[PDB]
Amino acid sequence: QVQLLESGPGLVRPSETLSLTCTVSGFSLTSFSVSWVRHPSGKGPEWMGRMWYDGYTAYNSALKSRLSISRDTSKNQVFLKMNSLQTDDTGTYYCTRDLYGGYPLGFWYFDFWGPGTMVTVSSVFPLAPGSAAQTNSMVTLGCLVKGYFPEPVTVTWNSGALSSGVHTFPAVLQSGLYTLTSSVTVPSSTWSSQAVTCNVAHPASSTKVDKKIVPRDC
Amino acid sequence: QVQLLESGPGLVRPSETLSLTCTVSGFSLTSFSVSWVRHPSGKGPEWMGRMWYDGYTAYNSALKSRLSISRDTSKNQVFLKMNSLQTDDTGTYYCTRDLYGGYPLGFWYFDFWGPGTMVTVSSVFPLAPGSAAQTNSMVTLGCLVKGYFPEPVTVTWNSGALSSGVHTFPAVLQSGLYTLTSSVTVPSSTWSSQAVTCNVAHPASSTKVDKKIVPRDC
Amino acid sequence: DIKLTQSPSLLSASVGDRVTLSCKGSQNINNYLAWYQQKLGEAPKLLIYNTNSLQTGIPSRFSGSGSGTDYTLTISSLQPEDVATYFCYQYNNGYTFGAGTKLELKRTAPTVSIFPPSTEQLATGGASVVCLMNNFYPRDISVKWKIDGTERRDGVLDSVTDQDSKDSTYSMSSTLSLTKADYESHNLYTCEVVHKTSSSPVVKSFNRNEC
Amino acid sequence: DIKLTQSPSLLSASVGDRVTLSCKGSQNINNYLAWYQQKLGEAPKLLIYNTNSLQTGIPSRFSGSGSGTDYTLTISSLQPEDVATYFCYQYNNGYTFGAGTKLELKRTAPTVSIFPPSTEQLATGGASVVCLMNNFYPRDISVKWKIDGTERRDGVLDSVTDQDSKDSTYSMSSTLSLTKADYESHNLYTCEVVHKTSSSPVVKSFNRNEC
To answer: Do B44 and C87 touch (CB under 8 A)?
Structure first.
């Protein structure tokens, strides 16, 4: 019954100050430890600091000088604050639960683009056969989420009741903007009678798009 | 890589003595100059004194008679002590870096309600729909941060993972008290399933309120 | 020292529009002038200095010119994130700023929503109703606090926010406030807006124990 | 602290195959070592901990083993959903991870389909066509975006996704995008594939106002 959710800005200007918030369920911050671990885009995990059960805090020497952890029982949170970023503090930052030395649960997951620019909502256009595919059980659809940045998006298909045959490829970088293109397979039966729909989200642009993804007519 | 942070009282009784602290980063106080500049509430910028690289200090004739600057290399700070304030000296005070004549960098920003009165923690009541708004993607919510002094409070919704659509109007004065009301705007999806919360902070009354906005029931 | 004068106290144009800003000292400023840009709750930024020289990061639509006394900052291609307050600083004689010059942009339309007192906010003999108006333009709105037919035109204050780094609109909160008393003394609670964007007026309502 | 080393950086075997992964500290780590698995865009999973001790969910093909300095994670029966990156974490001295070690299986076979712009996607001065290219085995392929006859080479950009948890295949989606314009300057739109798990390629096509 242990959670561990982490909130924080999606974008931070360099120079600035990053500040996330671990918000624990299922236990007591005075009877456990929590710490911050990051995955610097293009690197392996790195432990940053640890926030003891008795208030003491320890920092990764290297990351110490500018990173500082603390907590607030009453509301049940452990906080970061890292002043004087770089571009190469970018990536997803996680907070964890800690036992005899390592971490049993925790880690629901959290990302985190630090360049000097801003956001930019995603642009969702469907993907469908130009007549082509018809009677084969089995037809693949898709749903090109384009032009968004800092970083992820996350589509689900049909309110995630699909799942197999779902296939969201990574995304590459344009004239400074990210775009992907996720797809879905599915028997012809479901994709008449019954409707298949993608269902986009870009939480640093409170975007919550949903494009049904009907058959082409021409 | 140049920083320039300024610490100082929030409130100062009249008569008293104001005293701030420029705390430089990225340079050497024996190889640059630093000065104090202010923005008297309801007026334009005013240069106060300058603290050379060689120790000499220079004052704005006008402000000279009661303002006096000095520094402490070792710890890297440039100080300001201004004896005999008025309610005229109110407003944010900044310290700067200075080249060939003017300032390149520097300026973090730091306020000064300077009256003969005391603080007053903020009062955080929620803002939400009398049933009203339901299915439209977009729901606007908010918080009413009330009855606090001196300036400033700083609201951030969902630990600042929101941002898009975050609106915090400036505040107005009451029977001697400030109160402002920041608001947020989110897709109805995110309102239910997932929780939107504002975060209040009132530095000179070490207040750190957090009011989650649940949906009205009536 | 020298007094610096920034002629157009407030000036507004539109993306694309090339704008020109002024500042003139009361004594030959012998080309020692600098333009610092503000931007609500942020520290001033040095755009150009020594009369006409782009700082190491300010874009090129920025440009300085002048001769003792009269100087000028011109933005050849108003961008939408240029809304700011620009101050000129003169250091030939003795370090002085300028009143500054606000700078706005163009576009037009609104949006509304009302909010009653908190189950908390109430339980305190206080009940504060609010009417918020988001991302509207032009800056000119009008508000109307009316209760059951009524229209209590007092006990209400409101603010506006600055023009947007993003979609050049304004915003405006306004809150009428009263007792847990007469606020209890009514079901009905309405606020008409009125922009231009519309002739017929905008108005959202609410009824006591309803939410 | 201790530096952890994780010898084959990348190692690939086949379902069934019993694999063995290494990690060795620069100082006796006695026996506090932990293996965390990561699996692309998920949070790492604790497989075993202080040296050889199956977490309460990890199956039993996982299994720890070592003595100060040198440790080892073997997977006695590689399944297909084990491709991931495994990191070893050392907390005897000071709390450091390892470069990690990829782990790919091995297998073989493709599958394709093309998609022109959206009424929408088109309607705003742009057309982006995009050939998908699902659950194919030898990760390497290679495409070719034609156009009546024409073969525009760029203005495309693709990805491939990771090795499946389930059916150890990759996938690869790429687009080619234009102006709306010359889009709207052809009827013919085609994409040849080319794998291995055919000599003759593969290519699907698509004609303007047809769908």
So the answer is: yes
- Count Cβ atoms within 10 A of the Cβ of residue A126 and give its class: 0-12 exposed, 13-18 middle, 19 or more buried: buried
Give the whole-angstrom CA distance, residue D115 versus residue D122: 12
Rounded CA-CA distance D38/D33 in Å is: 16
* Contact yes or no for B160 and A9 at CB 8 A: yes
A48, closest residue in chain D (CA to CA): D95
Total beta-carbon pairs less than 8 A apart between chain A and chain B: 40
Enumerate the domain spans of chain D.
Answer: 1-107, 108-208
What resolution, expressed in A, was reported for this entry?
2.8
The strand pairing partners of D136, in sequence order, are D170
Task: Say which CATH class D108-208 falls into.
Answer: mainly beta
Is the CB of B9 inside 8 Å of chain A's CB atoms?
A: no
Experimental method: X-ray
Burial of A68 (0-12, 13-18, 19+ CB in 10 A): middle
| Tokens coding C34 | 């600098």
Q: Chain B contact for A8, CB < 8 A? A: yes
Provide the chain B residues 82-141 that lie in CB contact (below 8 A) with chain A.
137
In chain B, the domains with their CATH numbers are: 1-116 (2.60.40.10), 117-215 (2.60.40.10)
Q: Which residues touch D59 (CB under 8 Å, ≥6 apart)?
A: none
Residue B215 token pair:
């949906």
Give the separation between CA D53 and CA D64, rounded to whole angstroms: 7
* d(C-alpha B163, C-alpha B144), whole Å: 17
Q: What is the DSSP string of C111-169?
A: -EEEE---HHHHBTTEEEEEEEEEEEBSS----EEEESS----SSEEE---PPPTTT--
CB-based contacts of D154: which residues, under 8 Å, 6+ apart? Answer: none
Which stretches of chain D are DSSP H helices? 119-123, 180-184
**Strand pairing report for C10-12 and C101-104:** parallel
- Top-tier CATH class for D1-107: mainly beta
What are the beta bridge partners of residue C22?
C72
Interface test with A, best of B5, B23, B164, B185 (most A CBs within 10 A): B164
List the beta strands (DSSP E) in chain C: 4-5, 10-12, 18-25, 33-37, 45-49, 53-54, 64-67, 70-76, 84-90, 101-104, 112-115, 126-136, 144-147, 156-158, 170-179, 189-192, 203-204
Interface test with A, best of D56, D71, D115 (most A CBs within 10 A): D115
| Minimal C-alpha gap between A201 and chain D (Å) | 16
DSSP, residue by residue, A28-48 = -TTSSEEEEEEEETTS--EEE
Same CATH fold, D108-208 and D1-107?
yes
Three-class DSSP category at A200: coil
